[PDB]
Amino acid sequence: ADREDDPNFFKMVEGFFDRGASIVEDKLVEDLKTRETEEQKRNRVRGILRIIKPCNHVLSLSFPIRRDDGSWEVIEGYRAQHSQHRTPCKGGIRYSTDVSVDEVKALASLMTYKCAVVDVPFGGAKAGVKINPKNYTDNELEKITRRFTMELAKKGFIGPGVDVPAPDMSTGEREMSWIADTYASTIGHYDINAHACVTGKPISQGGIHGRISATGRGVFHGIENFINEASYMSILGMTPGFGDKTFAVQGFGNVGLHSMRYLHRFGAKCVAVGESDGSIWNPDGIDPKELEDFKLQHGTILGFPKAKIYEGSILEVDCDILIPAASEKQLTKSNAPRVKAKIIAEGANGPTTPEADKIFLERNIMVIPDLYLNAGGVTVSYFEWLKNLNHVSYGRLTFKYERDSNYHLLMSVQESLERKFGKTIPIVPTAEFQDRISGASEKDIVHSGLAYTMERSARQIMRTAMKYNLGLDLRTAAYVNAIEKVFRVYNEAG
Amino acid sequence: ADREDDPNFFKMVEGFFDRGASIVEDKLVEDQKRNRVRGILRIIKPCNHVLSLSFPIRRDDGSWEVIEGYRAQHSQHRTPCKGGIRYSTDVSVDEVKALASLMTYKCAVVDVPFGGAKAGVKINPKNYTDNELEKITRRFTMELAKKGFIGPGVDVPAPDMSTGEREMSWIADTYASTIGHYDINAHACVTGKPISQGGIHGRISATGRGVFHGIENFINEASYMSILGMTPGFGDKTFAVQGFGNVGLHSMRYLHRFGAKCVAVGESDGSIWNPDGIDPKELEDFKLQHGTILGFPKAKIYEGSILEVDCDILIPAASEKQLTKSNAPRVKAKIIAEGANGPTTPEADKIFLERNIMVIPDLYLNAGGVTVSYFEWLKNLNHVSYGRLTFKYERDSNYHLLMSVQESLERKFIPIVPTAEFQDRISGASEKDIVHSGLAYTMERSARQIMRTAMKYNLGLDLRTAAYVNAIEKVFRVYNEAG
Amino acid sequence: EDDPNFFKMVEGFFDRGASIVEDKLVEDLKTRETEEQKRNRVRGILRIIKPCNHVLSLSFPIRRDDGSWEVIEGYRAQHSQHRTPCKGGIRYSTDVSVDEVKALASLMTYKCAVVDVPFGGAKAGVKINPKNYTDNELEKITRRFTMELAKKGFIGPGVDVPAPDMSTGEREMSWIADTYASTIGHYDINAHACVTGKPISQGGIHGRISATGRGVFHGIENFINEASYMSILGMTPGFGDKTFAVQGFGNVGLHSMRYLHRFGAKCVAVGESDGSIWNPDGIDPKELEDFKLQHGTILGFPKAKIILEVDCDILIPAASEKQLTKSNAPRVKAKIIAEGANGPTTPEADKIFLERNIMVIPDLYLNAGGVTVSYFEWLKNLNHVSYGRLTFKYERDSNYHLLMSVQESLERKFGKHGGTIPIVPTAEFQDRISGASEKDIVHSGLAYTMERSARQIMRTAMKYNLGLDLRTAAYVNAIEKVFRVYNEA
Amino acid sequence: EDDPNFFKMVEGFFDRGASIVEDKLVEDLKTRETEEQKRNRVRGILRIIKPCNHVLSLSFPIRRDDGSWEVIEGYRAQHSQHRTPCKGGIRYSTDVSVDEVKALASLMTYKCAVVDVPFGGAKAGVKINPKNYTDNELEKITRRFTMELAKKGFIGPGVDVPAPDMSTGEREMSWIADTYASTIGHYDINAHACVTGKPISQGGIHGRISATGRGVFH
Ligand SMILES: Nc1ncnc2c1ncn2[C@@H]1O[C@H](COP(=O)(O)OP(=O)(O)O)[C@@H](O)[C@H]1O
Ligand SMILES: Nc1ncnc2c1ncn2[C@@H]1O[C@H](COP(=O)(O)OP(=O)(O)O)[C@@H](O)[C@H]1O
Ligand SMILES: Nc1ncnc2c1ncn2[C@@H]1O[C@H](COP(=O)(O)OP(=O)(O)O)[C@@H](O)[C@H]1O
Ligand SMILES: Nc1ncnc2c1ncn2[C@@H]1O[C@H](COP(=O)(O)OP(=O)(O)O)[C@@H](O)[C@H]1O
Q: Could you describe the subunit structure of this protein (chain C) (predicted)?
């Protein structure tokens, strides 16, 4: 089981909504410009906040599967659609015996608010199939995936304009490919956008370039947008920028490895890396390429030659930035006063308890919340869906056009200078620009789309925080920002 | 709350399936082979789909309210699904799942080609105005339609004791105006509709007439009656009805019409008794002017149920647990006719089997409304009332037959005219007569099917197990022969 | 039907009927509302019913056979959707207008309601004179008009089902169905139900050509067999010893004469556009039809002398023209006026007939047999089978088994002494069994429809104390039915 | 735009323009036809372009906030379908007429063609004075009018895309999109493209408020 399977995490998400809804309520009635009495206005605001909170639809399924040995098995599955204020719905599919209707409902609500902070036009959704994937062959997993897709499609729980699922830590790109293939072959055969019914697909099936590193890149951009803001950094007693900064990552998965790599690339020194099985530490620095290569040949980071065996988690290691990148409860009321980092970057869902949040606010520690920082994969999910709607890879028709314009601009500078100083002044691209031009592909535009989203959303969260004088309570600002946006869609629709 | 809201009634339905499935299992393999039979029985048992909804409603005072609702579709072996909608704070997902499964087996015993379904909206209708009940009904219809939980060929809802024909009219009107606007059969998305909206004639008494026909089919079978020590027919028979709603009143009026004497009538507030007989028209008129049957001049008051009154036929016509292990040995009736769902516990069933008391089960006896539901759905598909083009044709053929007999006899040797009863049948011929014949035929065919199933498995007076086995055999064959 | 005064008539008939039902509708309401709110609901619903809900005006191009282009103007009004699909004819005439198409659509709503045909009213008009176009150009106009209606929800088996008119026929209806089924309704299993009046080879129904005439007979028969209404007119029930006169010897007039004569009524006079004939001893319909088929006219008929004021019991205006006005209404000698066509009696003549105790059976009911059979054609196309196809042989065997049972029972009762008692069908029954086809079931459906609607109109007239004002009773009956659909929805 | 003389003006502008292009259009025809048949094609096509192809007149009920019912009269003309969808505003005014809606639809066809906007012209009018109605009643009118247009092919992302007017605004456009996406266009991924002039929170575009003024400058 994960932190996302924990019933206490579901109560947390509900509490974050309740806190945010009570803060926006008073300001929403003032901004209502409708020709109603003040009593009608408050009823409308409270009424809409009451509609937003619960999941609109939950589908429970029972479907048969014939095992490879010939015996039959009844599979139990569910999918919750929290909100339709934005269609289609969006959300992953978990294959786990630890799934429940309450999990699927809470994670669907979390997805609604996460999409709203990063301006992704989808309501939240979440599915769960109550099976342990380790107990099934690839053929049986395909049968389960294809039949589950069929039952969701017949009831409006999968479709390019209805609900677009995605993979999870328990599911992958091959299962997403089977979902799209089943939908396009049967229910969505007459739909030109049938392959946009699901994201996380392989590149050969309509997948998007830049999906594997989307979350890690989003964690970097999120830290970057706050670490370059001198107003927030002066409050933490630090200088802006990644230079002369130290960081520690708890969880060396795909998000842990990618964050570690991009922070290192910008001058930040990794002093410690934590894993499910022990931790490593080096105050002089840990190279991400050397550590990734070690883990790929030994299965673990334990025994890394250029680091010491640190006992337990690295949450209390002396660093500037702490990055919880694993889906588990890590920061609690007992270890929050022992945290030595000034910035806590949540690169996973729910690593900090509400009691730890309170301690961090008292200690002037900035927590960049999961609702914002863990939205990179969600942002590139949106771009994959758009790519399938577009029916073309990003930049396909404009890369060569841009390249010729760049050369024409450099030639114009060269000719103008030769004319001004008389007669050669060669104006050529740098080694880095030439490499960008030669290797120009879809991933560069997806990375750009993600960087712009994390930057625009960081400023939105900073503005929402300064409006309600929340200071370093970025989590409440992100929830208030999400609830304000969802409220306005319902209010202006009638 | 009702007996249909009780969690113990859900366990009962599950137990009836488990009992029936273990009995058919051995005979199904005869007709790797045991894996297919057990596998299909494992697929049949749980509900395939359950939809949970949360939808807003603006009250008449201006305030908003979030309404919680659900709809379960137990089976799609037959499409569309079919099942009522309950408006009650006592509804639950487990209720809606168990009642959907009950509807799959009930439809199968009466050869109604629908999978089972059931909906529930967690509200107390007494706390809402008619305008608010319309808002709830129309929004619930919209949310079901968008997810495949209402449609002429997908899922056809119906009313309940908590809902009526006005709500069904709103469902059909909302569906035909929005989601099903392009569907020629949009008005077939729901049954229990008023006549002005595509409803069928003969829907009001459908359940009551089904109870009468169900009883009549066993009461006129001398093989079953000799085992109970009785003569066939309703003549010289006595009966008692527990629950004087619409089913109890109709069943009382129909048995009386055929010679059976009503010795006792039970109600939620006390009961009345007269060994010489109670007239149904006199009792109905008394209740319509006083609100209760208490104080009826031609009967004596009794504080308690009539379940232990000396009679031949006992008719539990109210949806509540009445026959339990404590009062089952005190029952003096030889036939127990279940006019409501779940009035007898499994422990009482066992006592009745030991005492040679025949229990006509609810799965069969309470399927008259479900049968005429099928006919209303067919009427909306047909887009014409039953008999509209053939009544006059039949009348002319009958007159031509009588004229042929008259002419042949006058040639050989004489007015040949219809009887007063036949003339009245011809003159008053309307849709209700075809619906009544269709219901009587269904009840008669299903009774013989249940009798043959009971004789095939040597079940004797265990008609409930026979009805469940009959239903499971039919549902199994659809899955098995489809692949 | 092109006359603006006829549109004002239909509007006036609605206004008269709506004011009569208004008081009884509030009293019959069982809703949880105040009395002032219940009155607002009744007037509000009557205000919704009166005007046409939708009117579509079209402009579409046509390439003439000479190569030149022409812009054709057309319209279709759907008066009501309380019952879907809509139903109504298509007129090809330069005299069509939006007001015509709106008034005739409203008339069709009330006509469908009195005979329990579940369709809202509709009417289309294409502003062209069909005599100025070739068959190829008429096909082009028909197919393009069908396309423009289909794209806007003005034709479809479950949306709007058009029909022919006096200006249009079965070939045009066939082109409508063929255009719809080949393009917009290609994926519809019921595409051929998008229009009625089709030829038999295209899904048409048997019994369509004589539908109006059979309905005119059945409408008369249902009031003539009612002793209560006949005692008020000083007559005995039944067609025996009854005399009748028919004004207009077309398909309706001839058929009405043919069926009335078959039941004992004696035709004393027949009127035509060119003169009239008269014989108090009787005129044979078969002899008169054969004479007209070989001479083009009824003038010079040997068994008659060379008819609204003729002494008879039943007067049947069967031609679409103003015949009964305030000037000749006091000279009418008939006790029953059977309107076999639209608008033969003015409102002033209706008043005179009510004062003189003359029963006028209204066109809204009596001239609705064609509409009744149109519903059956639409049903036939939905059924995808002809009526009786699977049951004629079954019924025949049951009839023989019944006669055999009577024969065996009598031979058993009277013994061998006496002999065989053959029980065989009459010559008429044998002919019915041998020639059993769809038209016999369509004729049954029509007779039952007229019978049931006659009793409904009688009950409405008794409910509102209208007496012999059957026109107001038919309009009130139609408005009550349309109101109840809106109110209970 | 309510003035009958303005409608005659638009008709006169078309007649003037059509007579000028007529002579040059026959020369540019490269089809294998006779010169007389070439002129028949040009004049024939100009005769098709001039009138509105479709005009829908509606009568729909509305329950006022006081409980009383009111029958609302409305219309929508689609001048041309040479480019689909059609495009055009909705006016809420007691001064609207079928002739207004037809002339302004034709004006929109030619306006879209000069700015290479691929839409045919369209125009709607609802015969009501918005000042006499509450916001709740204006929402009821807007949602019911949307329903009646959608059922007859007079609103849809690929059929006819309405817009606001000086008498209507972004809240009404939001109600149109919400009604269409909830009922008739529920299965359409592009349901929110059924109308323009929407608020930003409902799919509106940035730069819409200053669009006419900027175009006047440009
Ligand atoms: N998931 C969402 N829920 C609610 N509102 C949203 C959501 N995503 C975006 N919005 C808001 O809807 C509006 C759409 O604006 P637009 O300019 O089209 O998109 P964006 O600026 O997000 O790229 C913005 O105000 C945006 O903040
Ligand atoms: N709800 C049901 N589930 C399973 N089988 C059914 C159901 N209803 C009917 N059947 C069976 O399906 C078959 C249909 O037979 P058919 O003669 O067409 O209909 P019926 O005899 O019931 O009028 C029969 O064997 C019938 O018993
Ligand atoms: N065109 C119509 N408009 C309104 N009500 C109608 C119309 N046609 C029929 N009705 C009524 O609707 C109801 C339908 O009853 P039903 O028994 O299904 O049909 P019918 O008896 O006409 O064959 C009847 O009360 C009938 O009078
Ligand atoms: N509303 C319209 N009606 C007719 N032709 C149009 C209309 N809008 C654009 N066109 C023409 O159609 C062609 C489309 O050309 P294209 O290059 O695809 O578009 P554009 O140049 O307008 O961006 C052009 O010749 C353009 O002038």
A: Homohexamer. Interacts with HADH; this interaction inhibits the activation of GLUD1.
